[PDB]
Design a protein around this ligand. Structure first.
Ligand SMILES: Nc1ncnc2c1ncn2[C@@H]1O[C@H](COP(=O)(O)OP(=O)(O)OP(O)(O)=S)[C@@H](O)[C@H]1O
Ligand SMILES: Nc1ncnc2c1ncn2[C@@H]1O[C@H](COP(=O)(O)OP(=O)(O)OP(O)(O)=S)[C@@H](O)[C@H]1O
Ligand SMILES: [Mg+2]
Ligand SMILES: [Mg+2]
Lengths: 395, 397
């Protein structure tokens, strides 16, 4: 657990518990301690047709943290069966889709608001805000985005559904991992609108919105228009590979001369980039595995110190336990040439690691009166510790 | 953190430390504590042309555990065979390839042996032994798992071929399995043992042999036939059509058959054939990596608990003052005895006390001194603040 990852995982735990008491936010029937997640001071109705609000809240029943998406000013009776379509989205298990649990309307916000509950992903930021704060992205990261979004659309389309909402502000970023964070919403907000589209047509719009998102990132232009669909498409050939340009072209262009666009057709176009991506995720999962084991090592190290602390100053004054006493002094009571304490976390860690591994390496244990000195190995010290601790269990 | 997952990580750590006191194995110039990994009492020379031995050993320099592949009865007749091979393979780092570090000869085994050192992956079992258990004899593997293998092996071949090299050794017994993660565990070996052989093959045909050996491995697993023969490359190929999808059959057929009518087989051509199965595979890996992320944060308490023990051990027994409560706190946590006088050992008590110390719990405890006249009512929160305070005053010096 190096410095950055350990404090990042602590920053995550800190974000999950994080509260803001004076905010003047209401408590729902099954939710409390609502925490505002919006990082910007402006809200527009371009994405949903209504203003949107984001919240982190605690469940009254299980105490775990969830994310709440609020759609301001939407009227719909809570008892309506349409809100239950989130149950179909719940069935979809995907790493690039934020799982939705349920949907309900509420009036605790002083109006008519619709609430979607999602998994809470700590330290998440929108893909827009991450790449466009108020200078080009590497192609590997762009392909990582292409592979992740395609993976999401694959599961969605095969579930006889569509993304509907596919934009930069509605995709959350967290350590290069992206997820669709507004699914199942438009399913409700467009259930009985004029000019309803088919799930077949909506699935096609996904591919178009897909291409535009990546194209925007590739051309480093936040606002994207139709008048430059071929202008910005030709700007990526020297900077990025022709393969990247080819995928963007396929996604954006209305490919309907003899056939309709399908996710299965998109996959071979990606091809080798999937292997590269999968390789990276596998290696990152490997790194998480070592940190897991290091942390489990810490537990074994803590349990060794438990035994050691039980024995010390408890019989314990003199004997084979006297060496255990002197061993503790060796590890934690180190002082400099002046006489001042030499605090050293590294020394503590490596001493106990060698004790846990029963290292054959030897160390010098000086007695209280610097007259007697013990040449002893970690292996011997470990065996004395287990021996003495067991003799206390006989009682 | 499910039951099996915690015990899996504990089985790994226990496997790395595992020793054999009665062993008659020597210590090498740079290696010691050699531990036998072989699951069988018999060794044949089919895989390498020489008997092979597997060992876990500790590095004298860094103290970490590595895997050692020993090739019995090998004399170095050319230093080019080790150096021209290992200089290229050492550079290749892949998630589906066991990293090789170096190769050297030794005589400590009472003979002339060649030694390869690899990364040590705990709890690893050969893909053969996992799907064909050793202690049983002669019922199908799920298709998703077969596709997982195809993606992983293809990923390995992708890195290998792009380095102008070949797997050479691509068989069930030379691939290690660990929680559905497979790795090529015999790379760079045949590169050395065949470095100056009479009938040296081209790097391109050896690469073609990779695809064939690829196909046979998956086909063997799909047909539940450990040994695979040339006479049933089309017979066993027809056993998979009702049980598995036609796509799998198409890939296996493509891999095994000498596909050179209009083009020669390349990994880039294999990728679109797998296609959507890569999305499925990557999704699972992402999902498992997500599950580890949540499990990590929960486990982080061990570091926080251990660092607290560091502070507590530094301060204690270095006599009187505010640290006297820290001394009495240690007595409360680890020195519990009954009215009778017997030791009250409790691993749970130790863990939960420190959890409350780590959480700065508002829960209160009773601290009676040796002199019973004064007793301190204090919470874990206050004790926690006293500990950091005392530990900080030692940093002033
Ligand atoms: N499912 C989620 N889990 C955790 N955090 C989230 C989730 N969804 C959104 N957030 C965070 O909430 C913040 C705001 O959410 P997004 O609303 O949808 O963007 P919004 O920028 O504030 O844009 P406006 O104008 O509504 S469209 C972002 O910074 C995210 O980091
Ligand atoms: N790099 C490694 N890291 C950890 N364990 C390994 C590694 N490589 C091999 N092993 C294990 O070592 C054991 C024996 O190695 P493998 O020898 O090559 O099996 P072996 O099948 O009996 O084949 P050989 O003797 O040619 S017949 C296996 O159970 C593996 O799981
Ligand atoms: Mg918002
Ligand atoms: Mg062997």
């Amino acid at each position: 657990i190096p410095k950055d990852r350990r404090e990042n995982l602590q920053k995550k735990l800190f974000h999950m518990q994080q509260l803001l008491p004076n905010s003047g936010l209401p408590n729902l029937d099954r939710w409390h301690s609502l925490f505002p997640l919006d990082t910007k001071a402006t809200r527009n109705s371009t994405c949903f047709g209504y203003p949107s609000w984001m919240y982190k809240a605690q469940n009254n029943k299980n105490g775990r943290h969830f994310a709440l998406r609020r759609i301001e000013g939407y009227r719909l009776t809570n008892e309506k069966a349409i809100l239950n379509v989130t149950k179909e989205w719940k069935k979809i298990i995907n790493a690039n889709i934020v799982t939705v649990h349920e949907a309900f309307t509420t009036e605790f916000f002083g109006d008519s608001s619709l609430i979607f509950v999602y998994d809470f992903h700590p330290l998440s930021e929108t893909l827009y805000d991450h790449h466009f704060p108020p200078n080009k992205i590497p192609e590997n990261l762009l392909w990582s985005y292409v592979c992740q979004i395609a993976n999401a659309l694959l599961a969605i389309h095969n579930a006889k559904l569509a993304a509907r909402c596919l934009e930069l502000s509605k995709i959350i970023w967290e350590n290069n991992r992206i997820r669709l964070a507004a699914c199942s919403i438009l399913d409700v907000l467009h259930h009985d609108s004029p000019n309803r589209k088919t799930i077949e047509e909506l699935q096609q719009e996904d591919f178009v919105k897909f291409g535009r998102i990546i194209l925007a990132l590739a051309t480093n232009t936040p606002t994207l228009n139709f008048n430059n669909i071929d202008a910005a498409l030709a700007t990526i050939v020297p900077r990025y590979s022709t393969q990247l340009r080819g995928v963007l072209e396929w996604l954006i262009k209305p490919s309907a001369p003899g056939e309709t666009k399908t996710v299965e057709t998109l996959m071979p176009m990606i091809g080798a980039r999937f292997a590269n991506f999968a390789n990276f995720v596998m290696q990152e999962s490997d790194e998480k595995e070592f940190h897991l084991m290091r942390e489990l090592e810490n537990g074994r190290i803590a349990r060794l110190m438990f035994k050691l602390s039980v024995v010390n100053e408890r019989w314990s004054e003199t004997g084979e336990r006297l060496l255990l006493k002197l061993f503790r002094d060796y590890v934690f009571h180190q002082v400099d040439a002046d006489g001042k304490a030499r605090l050293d976390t590294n020394h503590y860690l490596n001493c106990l690691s060698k004790l846990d591994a029963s290292s054959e390496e030897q160390i010098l244990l000086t007695s209280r009166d610097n007259a007697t000195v013990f040449v002893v190995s970690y292996r011997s010290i470990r065996q004395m510790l287990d021996r003495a601790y067991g003799e206390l269990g006989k009682e």
